[PDB]
Design a protein around this ligand. Structure first.
Ligand SMILES: [Cl-]
Ligand SMILES: [Cl-]
Ligand SMILES: [Cl-]
Ligand SMILES: [Cl-]
Ligand SMILES: [Cl-]
Ligand SMILES: [Cl-]
Ligand SMILES: [Cl-]
Ligand SMILES: [Cl-]
Ligand SMILES: [Cl-]
Ligand SMILES: [Cl-]
Ligand SMILES: [Cl-]
Ligand SMILES: [Cl-]
Ligand SMILES: [Cl-]
Ligand SMILES: [Cl-]
Ligand SMILES: [Cl-]
Ligand SMILES: [Cl-]
Ligand SMILES: [Cl-]
Ligand SMILES: [Cl-]
Ligand SMILES: [Cl-]
Ligand SMILES: [Cl-]
Ligand SMILES: [Cl-]
Ligand SMILES: [Cl-]
Ligand SMILES: [Cl-]
Ligand SMILES: [Cl-]
Ligand SMILES: [Cl-]
Ligand code: NA
Ligand code: NA
Ligand code: NA
Ligand code: NA
Ligand code: NA
Ligand code: NA
Ligand code: NA
Ligand code: NA
Ligand code: NA
Ligand code: NA
Ligand code: NA
Ligand code: NA
Ligand code: NA
Ligand code: NA
Lengths: 387, 387
């Protein structure tokens, strides 16, 4: 009864990875970076481009902490993308780095902003931490009193038709990083082939709006990345909520990558640099990232085989990986049936209120692709098998 | 609130170990023995002395399978004791090896039975698997239709006043292995100093009667060993029932050792030799045996700090070990406070419906002897710390 059926023959999106941001986290330590990027297996880092007035006279001091973070992640096998929260104040209609009075990028500074971003990309490259991609703006639809800069959907179109060729010849471009992943923010760019061609990755955040598929983006060949979100708490209930959010991004959103908010900026991050302690949300992320390898594809799996259980699955390099979330307050047994592959050597790891990415030592045997297992209360289990 | 307080200064009995029996299990494989005696860390083996009519003409064939079992356990760091379920039929009042018509040992064969047991002890020694102790009889108060032999409390006294000197000069003696650990079966032997002196270990089983302390035995200097019991099932509820039984033997019974019934004789054992699979009761035993070392003493700990949680603790070799059982259906948090020791480097391992003696990777910090942890539903956790 109510099997989780996994069909390795039905493939979905390619998984780029999972990560977090170093924005406003200073220069993170080797221990923090080892914890996250080696042990938990995160492999994407989002750095901030701090507003830098000296950019065009060779003064990069404002950027050196992120350089350091970038190098540490690259040394640990990760890729790095950059997000600017604002152009320098000299380019803003409000004459400040904040979002005061819905400040925006002066159209008379469009060429300079393009040059600015290219200067950051070349800085990072010249110092041995080349970027994988670059975003045009954080949350163009939010105007708070910290680094911010408004853009309308038409402004992104305006900008890209002029400067997208130059920018994309330099680096993969992410846009638009909407507050709530509003497709209207990017639709004008995607629907005009002149502008769509300059975009590689469609990025968005999950504040306020449910997770959704984005068919236009996928059908234009774009990656879809969830580039910022956080949750408050590290109790088991919050941890399984995070797990279900990642699962929903993978499954409903068809997203190629999931990127948590900041590593250490406050108590809602992944690592506490004041006590040198790992927040338990870290291990939720690890149940995906440590086990899902390079170039893996998501495949069909019964999304919810019984109440409060959620399942997704991935294949690559002759492995099958199954992530099974139990949001219930008690353990439950769950059967799995892998189709169109011959599976062996099943091993599992659990993160829960007690366990941190702990190998279970369970003695799982598979016959004709079927095995079963007990899922602890408020837990995430990852099965890895030969396939 | 409701701490489990551990006081290393208040010491109780010395722990000899934990084990199981190879009676009627044939000659067990290396894989079975590795599973139990290396990985789970059992370290006591109870062999049966099969009734052997050829004992006095050098025919030991009936004993060779147990010889093999004994050698395997000794090679894996364990000790071995032997239990006879019956003398040979030639010494029985019913002329058979069974318990038919409450058959007993003929008083005219007392000297021969003593010689018989000494022949088994010397056999085992001569072939490189010397025994640690020897029992006079299995379940002298039960007379079933398999190997059996009745003895009254006065018969044990009768026998020991004559043959105990000879027998005890050869080997540590266990008696009386009552069905339900009835102290009346051994009281006459213990209360006469002439007979008490020949006994080293008071052994008993747990069929039908609650676990109890045995002050007379402890006050005469004797070890108290639970030498046979089993439970039916391997579900989490049964596994925590077994854990609580061991805990009760340690705590209420002040027992030095706990010995499960047979390893592989039927489905109620610890290992299935037909499928080469380990029954989950094995891991319950391992949560005690693998972690509680040579010469450790039990110490004071809050027996039940909250409902359905049971705690015991042990020290030795500058370690403290804490076994915490959660019989509840949901996880609970539990605080621990170690007194009169300075503890560091706390690590934990869990056995549950999902986990088999699995290291948790939890990041437990202790300050002034206090730490806390989440105990999964229907689980056994063992903490080990430097002390
Ligand atoms: Cl894809
Ligand atoms: Cl900073
Ligand atoms: Cl650096
Ligand atoms: Cl506003
Ligand atoms: Cl617009
Ligand atoms: Cl549009
Ligand atoms: Cl939240
Ligand atoms: Cl930690
Ligand atoms: Cl935490
Ligand atoms: Cl298999
Ligand atoms: Cl495993
Ligand atoms: Cl198992
Ligand atoms: Cl003792
Ligand atoms: Cl046998
Ligand atoms: Cl042998
Ligand atoms: Cl009877
Ligand atoms: Cl009597
Ligand atoms: Cl008496
Ligand atoms: Cl039972
Ligand atoms: Cl097994
Ligand atoms: Cl089992
Ligand atoms: Cl510590
Ligand atoms: Cl640990
Ligand atoms: Cl932890
Ligand atoms: Cl649980
Ligand atoms: Na990756
Ligand atoms: Na990776
Ligand atoms: Na404002
Ligand atoms: Na934000
Ligand atoms: Na505001
Ligand atoms: Na990975
Ligand atoms: Na595996
Ligand atoms: Na021992
Ligand atoms: Na041992
Ligand atoms: Na009978
Ligand atoms: Na029995
Ligand atoms: Na009977
Ligand atoms: Na031990
Ligand atoms: Na330890």
């Amino acid at each position: 009864s109510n099997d989780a059926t996994i069909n390795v023959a039905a493939k979905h999106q390619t998984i780029r990875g999972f990560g977090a941001s170093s924005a406003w986290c200073g220069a993170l330590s080797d221990t923090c970076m080892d914890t996250l990027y080696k042990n938990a297996g995160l492999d994407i880092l989002r750095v901030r481009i701090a507003p830098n007035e000296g950019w065009n006279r060779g003064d990069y001091r404002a950027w050196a902490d992120e350089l350091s973070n970038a190098k540490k992640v690259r040394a640990r096998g990760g890729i790095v993308f950059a997000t600017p929260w604002t152009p320098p104040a000299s380019m803003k209609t409000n004459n400040t780095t904040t979002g005061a009075n819905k400040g925006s990028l002066k159209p008379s500074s469009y060429a300079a902003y393009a040059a600015y971003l290219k200067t950051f990309v070349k800085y990072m490259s010249d110092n041995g931490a080349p970027l994988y991609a670059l975003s045009l703006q954080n949350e163009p639809d939010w105007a708070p009193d910290y680094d911010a800069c408004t853009w309308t959907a038409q402004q992104f179109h305006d900008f890209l038709k002029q400067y997208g060729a130059s920018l994309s010849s330099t680096i993969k471009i992410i846009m638009p990083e909407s507050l709530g992943f509003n497709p209207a923010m990017s639709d004008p760019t995607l629907n005009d082939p002149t502008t769509a061609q300059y975009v590689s990755i469609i990025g968005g955040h999950l504040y306020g709006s449910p997770i959704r598929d984005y068919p236009l983006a996928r059908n234009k060949g774009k990656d879809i990345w969830m580039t910022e979100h956080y949750l408050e708490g590290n109790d088991p209930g919050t941890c399984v909520k995070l797990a279900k959010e990642i699962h929903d991004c993978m499954t409903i959103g068809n997203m190629n990558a999931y990127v948590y908010w900041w590593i250490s900026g406050d108590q809602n991050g992944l690592y506490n640099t004041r006590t040198n302690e790992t927040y338990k949300k870290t291990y939720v992320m690890g149940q995906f990232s440590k086990f899902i390898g390079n170039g893996y594809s998501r495949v069909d799996a019964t999304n919810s085989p019984q109440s409060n259980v959620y399942v997704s699955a991935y294949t690559g390099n002759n492995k099958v990986v199954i992530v099974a979330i139990n949001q219930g307050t008690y353990p439950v047994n769950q059967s799995f049936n892998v189709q169109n592959s011959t599976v062996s050597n099943v091993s599992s790891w659990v993160s829960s209120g007690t366990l941190n990415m702990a190998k279970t030592n369970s003695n799982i045997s598979a016959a004709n692709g079927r095995f079963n297992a007990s899922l602890p209360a408020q837990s995430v289990t990852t099965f890895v098998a030969d396939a």
